[PDB]
Design a protein around this motif. Structure first.
Motif, PDB file in Angstrom:
ATOM      1  N   UNK A   1       0.791  -1.227   0.000  1.00 20.49           N
ATOM      2  CA  UNK A   1       0.000   0.000   0.000  1.00 20.49           C
ATOM      3  C   UNK A   1       0.826   1.283   0.000  1.00 20.49           C
ATOM      4  N   UNK A   2       0.132   2.390   0.280  1.00 19.81           N
ATOM      5  CA  UNK A   2       0.707   3.738   0.337  1.00 19.81           C
ATOM      6  C   UNK A   2       0.387   4.321   1.700  1.00 19.81           C
ATOM      7  N   UNK A   3       1.412   4.868   2.352  1.00 19.19           N
ATOM      8  CA  UNK A   3       1.298   5.226   3.769  1.00 19.19           C
ATOM      9  C   UNK A   3       0.997   3.958   4.562  1.00 19.19           C
ATOM     10  N   UNK A   4       1.697   2.882   4.191  1.00 20.90           N
ATOM     11  CA  UNK A   4       1.739   1.621   4.930  1.00 20.90           C
ATOM     12  C   UNK A   4       3.119   1.035   4.716  1.00 20.90           C
ATOM     13  N   UNK A   5       4.061   1.942   4.544  1.00 20.74           N
ATOM     14  CA  UNK A   5       5.415   1.587   4.270  1.00 20.74           C
ATOM     15  C   UNK A   5       6.037   1.149   5.584  1.00 20.74           C
ATOM     16  N   UNK A   6       5.336   1.443   6.672  1.00 23.73           N
ATOM     17  CA  UNK A   6       5.860   1.190   7.997  1.00 23.73           C
ATOM     18  C   UNK A   6       5.285  -0.045   8.714  1.00 23.73           C
ATOM     19  N   UNK A   7       4.419  -0.785   8.037  1.00 26.80           N
ATOM     20  CA  UNK A   7       3.784  -1.948   8.617  1.00 26.80           C
ATOM     21  C   UNK A   7       4.519  -3.201   8.197  1.00 26.80           C
ATOM     22  N   UNK A   8       4.983  -3.971   9.181  1.00 24.73           N
ATOM     23  CA  UNK A   8       5.643  -5.232   8.942  1.00 24.73           C
ATOM     24  C   UNK A   8       4.878  -6.420   9.525  1.00 24.73           C
ATOM     25  N   UNK A   9       4.742  -7.481   8.757  1.00 26.66           N
ATOM     26  CA  UNK A   9       4.179  -8.675   9.332  1.00 26.66           C
ATOM     27  C   UNK A   9       4.992  -9.945   9.073  1.00 26.66           C
ATOM     28  N   UNK A  10       4.893 -10.926   9.949  1.00 27.85           N
ATOM     29  CA  UNK A  10       5.369 -12.273   9.612  1.00 27.85           C
ATOM     30  C   UNK A  10       4.438 -13.353  10.209  1.00 27.85           C
ATOM     31  N   UNK A  11       4.547 -14.563   9.669  1.00 26.60           N
ATOM     32  CA  UNK A  11       3.705 -15.697   9.993  1.00 26.60           C
ATOM     33  C   UNK A  11       4.536 -16.873  10.507  1.00 26.60           C
ATOM     34  N   UNK A  12       4.172 -17.370  11.677  1.00 23.84           N
ATOM     35  CA  UNK A  12       4.814 -18.540  12.227  1.00 23.84           C
ATOM     36  C   UNK A  12       3.812 -19.361  13.023  1.00 23.84           C
ATOM     37  N   UNK A  13       4.073 -20.653  13.081  1.00 23.69           N
ATOM     38  CA  UNK A  13       3.247 -21.599  13.758  1.00 23.69           C
ATOM     39  C   UNK A  13       3.695 -21.535  15.172  1.00 23.69           C
ATOM     40  N   UNK A  14       2.735 -21.436  16.086  1.00 20.03           N
ATOM     41  CA  UNK A  14       2.983 -21.280  17.503  1.00 20.03           C
ATOM     42  C   UNK A  14       3.608 -22.543  18.109  1.00 20.03           C
ATOM     43  N   UNK A  15       4.691 -22.365  18.855  1.00 17.05           N
ATOM     44  CA  UNK A  15       5.431 -23.482  19.460  1.00 17.05           C
ATOM     45  C   UNK A  15       4.532 -24.401  20.352  1.00 17.05           C
ATOM     46  N   UNK A  16       3.928 -23.852  21.418  1.00 15.65           N
ATOM     47  CA  UNK A  16       2.947 -24.608  22.247  1.00 15.65           C
ATOM     48  C   UNK A  16       1.706 -25.032  21.441  1.00 15.65           C
ATOM     49  N   UNK A  17       0.740 -24.111  21.328  1.00 17.55           N
ATOM     50  CA  UNK A  17      -0.624 -24.320  20.762  1.00 17.55           C
ATOM     51  C   UNK A  17      -0.799 -24.725  19.289  1.00 17.55           C
ATOM     52  N   UNK A  18       0.272 -24.730  18.508  1.00 12.40           N
ATOM     53  CA  UNK A  18       0.227 -25.250  17.118  1.00 12.40           C
ATOM     54  C   UNK A  18      -0.555 -24.451  16.034  1.00 12.40           C
TER      55      UNK A  18
ATOM     56  N   UNK B   1       9.235   2.217  13.497  1.00 12.82           N
ATOM     57  CA  UNK B   1       9.757   3.581  13.355  1.00 12.82           C
ATOM     58  C   UNK B   1      10.362   3.832  11.961  1.00 12.82           C
ATOM     59  N   UNK B   2      11.365   3.039  11.566  1.00 13.42           N
ATOM     60  CA  UNK B   2      11.956   3.111  10.215  1.00 13.42           C
ATOM     61  C   UNK B   2      11.085   2.403   9.155  1.00 13.42           C
ATOM     62  N   UNK B   3      11.400   2.535   7.855  1.00  9.46           N
ATOM     63  CA  UNK B   3      10.424   1.913   6.966  1.00  9.46           C
ATOM     64  C   UNK B   3      10.504   0.379   7.010  1.00  9.46           C
ATOM     65  N   UNK B   4       9.361  -0.265   6.815  1.00  7.32           N
ATOM     66  CA  UNK B   4       9.273  -1.690   7.056  1.00  7.32           C
ATOM     67  C   UNK B   4      10.002  -2.514   6.028  1.00  7.32           C
ATOM     68  N   UNK B   5      10.579  -1.913   4.993  1.00  2.63           N
ATOM     69  CA  UNK B   5      11.205  -2.764   3.978  1.00  2.63           C
ATOM     70  C   UNK B   5      12.593  -3.133   4.381  1.00  2.63           C
ATOM     71  N   UNK B   6      13.157  -2.381   5.310  1.00  2.00           N
ATOM     72  CA  UNK B   6      14.476  -2.687   5.830  1.00  2.00           C
ATOM     73  C   UNK B   6      14.437  -3.972   6.572  1.00  2.00           C
ATOM     74  N   UNK B   7      13.280  -4.304   7.144  1.00  2.02           N
ATOM     75  CA  UNK B   7      13.190  -5.507   7.935  1.00  2.02           C
ATOM     76  C   UNK B   7      13.138  -6.610   6.932  1.00  2.02           C
ATOM     77  N   UNK B   8      12.239  -6.494   5.968  1.00  2.72           N
ATOM     78  CA  UNK B   8      12.126  -7.498   4.928  1.00  2.72           C
ATOM     79  C   UNK B   8      13.476  -7.734   4.268  1.00  2.72           C
TER      80      UNK B   8
END
Length: 123
Positions: free
Chosen positions: A74-91, A101-108
């Protein structure tokens, strides 16, 4: 290597949602759902850590190789980061969402470095 972020919460995903080229859309619906705790998100040792800023206390530790997918909104969503993982306990498959704070693409980008350096290094 180390990013200031804000935890927005998570949404449960179905394994169907992770199927290739249905996932990108899906992760996006998730950032949308959750984005209109102040923590440090570290990358270190093929592990994604969530750390409490003053105490330096490890709150959560996610092995990079079992992360199922990640995304930046999106636009003005440059700062939103997500990831997906299966929960260790509950599955269950959870998709966690963060506003950084910084733009989310640096994380990616860094997760790609860490990933590459592993595929490569695996000879």
């Amino acid at each position: 290597k180390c990013f200031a972020v804000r935890s927005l919460g998570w949404v449960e995903m179905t394994e169907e949602e992770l199927a290739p080229g249905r996932s990108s859309v899906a992760v996006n619906n998730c950032i949308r759902q959750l984005s209109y705790k102040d923590l440090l998100l570290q990358l270190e040792d093929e592990t994604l850590k969530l750390v409490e800023p003053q105490s330096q206390a490890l709150l959560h530790a996610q092995p990079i190789i079992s992360i199922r997918v990640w995304g930046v909104g999106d636009s003005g969503r440059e700062r939103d980061f997500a990831y997906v993982a299966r929960d260790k306990l509950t599955q269950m498959l959870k998709c966690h969402v963060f506003r950084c704070e910084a733009p989310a693409k640096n994380i990616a980008t860094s997760l790609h470095e860490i990933c590459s350096k592993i595929m490569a290094e695996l000879e």
